Amino acid sequence: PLILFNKDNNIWNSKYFRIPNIQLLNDGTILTFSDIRYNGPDDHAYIDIASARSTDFGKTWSYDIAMKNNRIDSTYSRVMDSTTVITNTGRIILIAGSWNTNGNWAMTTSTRRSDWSVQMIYSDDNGLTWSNKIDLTKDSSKVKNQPSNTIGWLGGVGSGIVMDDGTIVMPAQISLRENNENNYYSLIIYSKDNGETWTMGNKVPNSNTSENMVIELDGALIMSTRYDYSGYRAAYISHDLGSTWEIYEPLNGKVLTGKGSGCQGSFIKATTSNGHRIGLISAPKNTKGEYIRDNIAVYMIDFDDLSKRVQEICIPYPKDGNKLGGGYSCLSFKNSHLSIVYEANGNIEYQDLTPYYSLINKQ
Numbered sequence: 001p002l003i004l005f006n007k008d009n010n011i012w013n014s015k016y017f018r019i020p021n022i023q024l025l026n027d028g029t030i031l032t033f034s035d036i037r038y039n040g041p042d043d044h045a046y047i048d049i050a051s052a053r054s055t056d057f058g059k060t061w062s063y064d065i066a067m068k069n070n071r072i073d074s075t076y077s078r079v080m081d082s083t084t085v086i087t088n089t090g091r092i093i094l095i096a097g098s099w100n101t102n103g104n105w106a107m108t109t110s111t112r113r114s115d116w117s118v119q120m121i122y123s124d125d126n127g128l129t130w131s132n133k134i135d136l137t138k139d140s141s142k143v144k145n146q147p148s149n150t151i152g153w154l155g156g157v158g159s160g161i162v163m164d165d166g167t168i169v170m171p172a173q174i175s176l177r178e179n180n181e182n183n184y185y186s187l188i189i190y191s192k193d194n195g196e197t198w199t200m201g202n203k204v205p206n207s208n209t210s211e212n213m214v215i216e217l218d219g220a221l222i223m224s225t226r227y228d229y230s231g232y233r234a235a236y237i238s239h240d241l242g243s244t245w246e247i248y249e250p251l252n253g254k255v256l257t258g259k260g261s262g263c264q265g266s267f268i269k270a271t272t273s274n275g276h277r278i279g280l281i282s283a284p285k286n287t288k289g290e291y292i293r294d295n296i297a298v299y300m301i302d303f304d305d306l307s308k309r310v311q312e313i314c315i316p317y318p319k320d321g322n323k324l325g326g327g328y329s330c331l332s333f334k335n336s337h338l339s340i341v342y343e344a345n346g347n348i349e350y351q352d353l354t355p356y357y358s359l360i361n362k363q
């Protein structure tokens with residue numbers, strides 16, 4: 001596998017990289033992102049978001065800083081946890097969490113976290129140049145239906161999707177002040193105007209849900225979400241673009257995530273040549289438990305063949321994760337091609353998994 005962001009050899013002399021992201025563009029360009037964790041693995045630290053772009057199918061890469069932090073605090077200023085999408089116009093949107101103080105985004109404050117915001121950038125030239133940062137949360141003019149009891153929120157970490165009519169849907173996570181406690185939940189946001197403005201959906205049925213992605217299936221949203229301390233990825237389905245949810249049994253509890261906290265993973269849809277819609281999930285098996293997050297695996301379900309059990313396709317990273325921070329992954333599928341980026345011992349690695357797709361596609 002190619003080392004895409006190398007802690008030991010990179011243009012920022014960053015000590016560590018985390019939270020990778022990938023989009024395969026229609027024209028065969030590969031666009032990736034990662035947290036530049038300049039000072040080490042810590043989440044609560046000085047972080048910008050890098051891009052790496054390839055026009056030769058992942059042989060060589062161009063690097064840039066896609067989004068800088070607010071530069072307020074040289075210890076704690078951070079933009080992080082990229083969620084991305086390509087719209088029907090080809091526009092590339094990136095949404096990041098922004099903070100500049102110490103302490104967990106969800107749990108530190110009992111009121112709206114004062115240094116918190118959600119920052120958005122877009123590219124109209126296939127990720128060559130970006131807009132200025134747009135602040136989605138400083139006022140009420142960009143994101144409708146934000147709960148008054150919001151502590152904070154950011155994207156679900158991974159990729160969003162486009163509905164048939166062109167509506168953009170992004171996975172999100174929120175922290176809500178409820179009866180003297182902070183509870184965190186998954187949900188979605190959507191845009192009908194190419195990302196200019198958004199509406200927030202409602203929270204999923206269970207707290208302790210966070211990082212997630214959704215696919216579209218026949219107008220429904222199906223979510224695969226990190227469900228902390230359950231030992232598995234939860235799955236829910238919405239028939240009303242994220243207003244209401246119920247358990248989605250065929251995926252709920254089917255991907256096991258081992259002892260301790262959950263882990264980010266990715267969940268995408270592919271349509272094979274026989275017309276079957278398949279779901280692909282990347283996540284660590286975490287057989288060793290907690291933050292070890294060993295064995296980043298790829299799993300498959302066939303929505304058009306639900307009595308067939310979820311199958312492990314391959315294990316792109318058959319190694320222990322680094323306990324300081326590892327395990328995260330992102331798939332992208334486009335035009336019969338499949339690629340993954342994942343965390344590997346403080347680096348980001350890249351693999352083309354198209355050969356595995358060919359095995360599934362049968363042919």
Ligand SMILES: CC(=O)N[C@H]1[C@H]([C@H](O)[C@H](O)COC(C)=O)O[C@@](O)(C(=O)O)C[C@@H]1O
Pocket residue numbers: 019043080081097104105106107184210211262263264325326
């Ligand atoms: C913004 C942030 O803090 N993101 C980090 C996230 C998070 O802290 C964890 O979901 C716990 O959030 C809650 C809701 O309690 O989780 C990771 O620390 C991890 O590797 O698990 C890496 C990731 O950048």
